[PDB]
DNA sequence: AAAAAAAA
DNA sequence: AAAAAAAA
DNA sequence: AAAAAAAA
């Protein structure tokens, strides 16, 4: 599977939404 | 009642299909568009070959499919449509020869060319809108291959160049790339990954997208994002009255295409490169949130920080 | 008693442009700069054709350009100006043929010719200060598709050859981009963004932009920044008794122009590339402040951290 | 007693412009020494033209100064200066030939031609210190727009060839980048932007910058740096009673000319040389013009 | 903070 | 926030 | 979230 949360909307992406923390 | 573009689909797409051609489902309406825009390039068997500036490897297949018969009347297309027997005729008249340009046509002064000319274009443009929306759809329950990380989920749809040609501004991929890489004129238009863009059923109709209107989780999320968008935008749904299938809209996200966050240097100040990021040196990007317009007003949600893909895949467990 | 530069334009604005032009909004001075321009610069269409190294492509286009029916009397350019029937005798006598160079003329030694190329040149220049301000005025909210990283919202305004030829100081672009990236001879001119250049119903009179005159925010802000300066500029503006979009200017930023911060090495000192952000290790970025020329005096403004554009959104 | 360097500049001035020439205002001895470096470069209208290896724009631009009028007496250069009638024969007379070559001149042996070709040298080297410290002068309160970063920074002042081929040590621009960033040889001088030079007004009566002579904030700043130099170095000047934009040195950096190293950066001090002895004064961490700039209200 | 040499 | 010169 | 230009 692929985690990657690109960004939109403002919002900013990220690379993995497990490791943000 | 409707305008030029959504008239031409609808009277092509009737002559094509003729009653097998459903009108409230998304699907047949994407594979219908579909096969359109296959026909409308010249990219079905038996016609003409692409050969200009084609390579030889490019002229062997164009060669080969113009050897292949055409397709025959009553050929299955998708799952629920079905060629008639005048889609030849359609296909001779309606379609313009390979290599037409909209200036000679204007040249030529021909009145009914130069309409037959436009709305062809309308219809490239109509077709590929609905390929950019099914590919969306797709993607939120399909990842694609192709994207492993940030940098090429940036591309996102990868369409051919026709789709990128009718609809640049929406259309992404390679050609894209190939065009933000190189120079930028005055005509340049940025990838906006995030437009809305109806659902088809609506595309064709000519409702505008909006609040209060009775759709799917899925399509409505298509509408306005794809798999890999941040999953706070469910928000902008609610299941009606007894659960079912089909919700209501409660409100649209806001910056869909104008975003920038650059401070530029000036008056003695220091350029910024995110405004967002810059902070103080907390880089906690949970506490983001989007602000999503209702009917009652503006509300500002706080961003779920998971891809719509995954969200839809925990939600359907 | 304006100066030859303003009298030219007001002139040629009128001859052109009979009673439709209107000499107190700035988006139909915007239009009529655009189109005066255009017209000098001989891009309408029936003008001569720009064929002297012009490429395939080129060469086509500028030979259809020359072949389009030009434009005719009680033609609408843009929303409230028409077209007089006088205009084809003001562009066949008052725009210098294609090519003429000021130093033939001068060589040549004929007044009224001199004269011509002089009023051309200065019509230029003035044309090209209004197109920069509605360049910047439009950037307020609606940003360029070239603009996605600092580098490239470095080069702000991009406008086309001849506007950098006529402001080499103000106009930017890919003509800016090549300068700088390139020889700088003696006579080279820095790329001034914020240079303040007055509203265009201020500049087609002689007014020079200060404190106390009755303006819009976007115009002040078009004024002195564009979209992507930060907000903080905003504060020079002040509403006045109910509002309405109109208020007055209470302050005007300073450094607007001349911004170096750098420390060569000397005396046995070490180089600084940047003063503000060397400190100590501390580089709050929030904390930097504009100097701001008030009616009473200097005023240090604490910065705001977002762009005018986004915070024109966020507070509209 | 003056040297004969300061001498034939003296000279040259007062049969240029006559008693037109202050020998007390700094601007005014700029712009004599600008226009004397000027006429003895061979580039007043009217002069002889640099058509030996010239291109298509130069050669043009040569043969149009050639042609042009040349000065005439009565003519206004600057604000204070006025040439006189004398001005031609002190050019045919003084100003060698354009391509003159001290070689050829010393192996003809006249001694003549020898004593006005070195005057010739010196006038131009006084001339180009003068244009360096007018530079220096002007650099503290408007900088330079092609210097935008420390590697441009690192090759002020942006003057001509002539000034440098003149005074290469003090001069810098494009061909002290070009000396710099190429072979060197042996006869290299190394470009020292913080040479001490006494104002001109100083330098044409040959007194030495010292410790107790009147000058003023700017004088001093742009005799022993420029703007873009750290602001510590205004602590060498000391306003006199009631100020009056005059004051007096009470000392000169040291290490000036040469240096050589082969919190703490804004803890770095520098040497200052004072009557009772060597102190040690802390940096300032901003640059003369901006400090300059915050300072001036 | 001297004597010699030597333009895009 | 002036005088001179000068297109992908 | 109009029109006219216009293939790896």
């Not at chain 2, 489902?25 to 692409?50: P, R």
């Not at chain 2, 990954?193 to 595309?203: D, E, G, K, N, Y």
């Not at chain 2, 706070?232 to 009606?240: D, G, Y």
Request: glycine residues 8%.
């Amino acid at each position: 599977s692929c985690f990657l949360v690109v960004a939109s909307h403002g919002l900013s992406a990220i690379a993995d939404s497990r490791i943000e923390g | 009642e409707l305008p030029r573009n959504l008239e031409v689909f609808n009277e092509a797409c009737g002559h094509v299909f003729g009653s097998s051609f459903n009108r409230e489902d998304n699907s047949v309406i994407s594979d219908a568009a579909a096969f359109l825009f296959k026909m409308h390039t010249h990219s079905l068997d038996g016609q003409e070959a692409k050969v200009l500036r084609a390579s030889e490897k490019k002229r062997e297949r164009e060669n080969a499919k113009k050897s292949r018969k055409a397709p025959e009347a009553g050929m299955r297309v998708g799952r629920s449509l079905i060629l008639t027997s005048r889609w030849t005729e359609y296909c001779a008249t309606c379609v313009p020869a390979l290599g037409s340009k909209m200036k000679v046509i204007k040249a030529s002064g021909d009145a009914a060319m130069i309409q037959m000319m436009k709305d062809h274009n309308s219809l490239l443009r109509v077709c590929v809108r609905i390929e950019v929306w099914k590919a969306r759809y797709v993607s939120l329950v399909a990842l694609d291959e192709r994207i492993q990380t940030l940098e090429d989920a940036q591309w996102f749809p990868y369409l051919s160049g026709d789709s990128y040609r009718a609809c640049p501004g929406l259309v992404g991929g390679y050609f894209a790339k190939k065009a933000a890489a190189g120079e930028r004129g005055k005509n340049y238009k940025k990838l906006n990954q995030t437009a809305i863009i109806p659902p088809p059923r609506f595309l064709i109709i000519g409702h505008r997208l909006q609040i209060g209107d009775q759709v799917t989780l899925r399509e409505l999320l298509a509408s306005i994002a794809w798999g890999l968008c941040d999953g706070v935008l469910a928000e902008c749904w609610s299941p009606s009255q007894g659960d079912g299938s089909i919700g209501v809209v409660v409100g649209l996200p806001l910056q869909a295409t104008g975003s920038c966050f650059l401070v530029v240097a000036s008056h003695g100040l220091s350029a910024i490169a995110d405004s967002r990021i810059e902070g103080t040196g907390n880089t906690n990007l949970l506490e983001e949130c989007i602000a999503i317009q209702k009917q009652d007003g503006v509300i500002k949600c706080k961003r779920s920080g998971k891809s719509l893909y995954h969200c839809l895949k925990e939600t359907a467990g």
